[PDB]
Design an enzyme around this catalytic site. Structure first.
Site, PDB file in Angstrom:
ATOM      1  N   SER A 184       1.236  -3.265   3.886  1.00  0.00           N
ATOM      2  CA  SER A 184       1.387  -4.619   4.383  1.00  0.00           C
ATOM      3  C   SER A 184       0.927  -5.570   3.298  1.00  0.00           C
ATOM      4  O   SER A 184       0.071  -5.236   2.477  1.00  0.00           O
ATOM      5  CB  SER A 184       0.600  -4.842   5.669  1.00  0.00           C
ATOM      6  OG  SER A 184      -0.783  -4.762   5.422  1.00  0.00           O
ATOM      7  N   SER A 198       0.797  -1.221   0.000  1.00  0.00           N
ATOM      8  CA  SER A 198       0.000   0.000   0.000  1.00  0.00           C
ATOM      9  C   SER A 198       0.829   1.270   0.000  1.00  0.00           C
ATOM     10  O   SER A 198       0.240   2.349  -0.143  1.00  0.00           O
ATOM     11  CB  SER A 198      -0.952   0.020   1.193  1.00  0.00           C
ATOM     12  OG  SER A 198      -1.966  -0.942   0.981  1.00  0.00           O
TER      13      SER A 198
HETATM   14  B1  LIG Z   1      -2.074  -2.133   1.850  1.00  0.00           B
HETATM   15  O1  LIG Z   1      -0.874  -2.773   1.878  1.00  0.00           O
HETATM   16  O2  LIG Z   1      -2.457  -1.616   3.232  1.00  0.00           O
HETATM   17  C1  LIG Z   1      -3.572  -2.395   3.595  1.00  0.00           C
HETATM   18  C2  LIG Z   1      -4.100  -3.018   2.409  1.00  0.00           C
HETATM   19  C3  LIG Z   1      -4.557  -4.520   2.717  1.00  0.00           C
HETATM   20  O3  LIG Z   1      -4.645  -5.239   1.517  1.00  0.00           O
HETATM   21  O4  LIG Z   1      -3.138  -3.007   1.427  1.00  0.00           O
END
Ligand SMILES: *[B@@]1([O])O[C][C]([C][O])O1
EC number: 3.5.2.6
Length: 261
Positions: free
Chosen positions: A210, A43
């Site tokens: 994540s 993300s």
């Molecule tokens: B990003 O990485 O932050 C939370 C979301 C969960 O898929 O993606």
């Protein structure tokens, strides 16, 4: 240096692979640990998509107020804000805020669509001088974080330089930059990551990430009270596909960097 020895020790203690890049804008000095290795962005890539839409709004002055319909088919795996607006609309500003401050994956996919696909996000990176960033997939598959897979990766050095340009530099117009900074400072997902390793008096704007392989990331702009700002990128990934997140590693890396100043 002391800091590189402590970061290597932290990495060894963690069982994973740590990438760090610090830019101190006071003297434009850099501290790098695995700074030119690729890491899955997860993300943290949402910053680039939001910034690309902000760049579009420099010419399309009302773009951020454009309503975008959220349909049930749009929902993916993690949509804390979009879920609240199913069968209604969110503006591009609201989607940008949701992607950044809540890491909403539906919001990210709407931003990607607005840019014409992942290639449109990557194109913006190239346009501001980032030759390293690549966005290949949409949510949620861009988080697979498979070891060795170059898709949806960047390097710490590249991301730190790009985050500096977007927030402290002039890759964006003045109103757009200020908006991005406001959004990052309002992040809600970062309390256990870089922020947790820093003095509580410092102002931080950050975006976490994540993914699979225990991938645990955070990219931050840091405004110490009475001191030039810093840009800090911390990427971490692990060898087991089902590894647990390790936000404490990012906190510890921030603490090590902060000690060295
Ligand atoms: B990003 O990485 O932050 C939370 C979301 C969960 O898929 O993606």
């Amino acid at each position: 240096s002391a800091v590189q020895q402590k970061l290597a020790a932290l990495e060894k203690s963690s069982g994973g692979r740590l990438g760090v890049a610090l830019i101190d804008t006071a003297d434009n000095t850099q501290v790098l640990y695995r700074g030119d290795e690729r890491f899955p962005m997860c993300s943290t890539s949402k910053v680039m998509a939001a910034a690309a839409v902000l760049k579009q709004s420099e010419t399309q002055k009302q773009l951020l107020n454009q309503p975008v319909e959220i349909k049930p088919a749009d929902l993916v795996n993690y949509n804390p804000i979009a879920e609240k607006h199913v069968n209604g609309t969110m503006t591009l500003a609201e989607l940008s805020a949701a992607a950044l401050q809540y890491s909403d994956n539906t919001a990210m996919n709407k931003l990607i669509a607005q840019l014409g696909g992942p290639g449109g996000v990557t194109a913006f990176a190239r346009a501001i001088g980032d030759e390293t960033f690549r966005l290949d997939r949409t949510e949620p598959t861009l988080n697979t974080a498979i070891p060795g897979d170059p898709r949806d990766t960047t390097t710490p050095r590249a991301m730190a330089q790009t985050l500096r340009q977007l927030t402290l530099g002039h890759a964006l117009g003045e109103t757009q930059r200020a908006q991005l900074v406001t959004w990052l400072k309002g992040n809600t997902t970062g309390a256990a990551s870089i922020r947790a390793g820093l003095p509580t008096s410092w102002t931080v704007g950050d975006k976490t990430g994540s993914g699979d392989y225990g991938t645990t990331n955070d990219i931050a702009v840091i405004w110490p009270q009475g001191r030039a700002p810093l840009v800090l990128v911390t990427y971490f990934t692990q060898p087991q596909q089902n590894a647990e997140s390790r936000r404490d590693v990012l906190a510890s890396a921030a603490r090590i960097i902060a000690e060295g100043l």
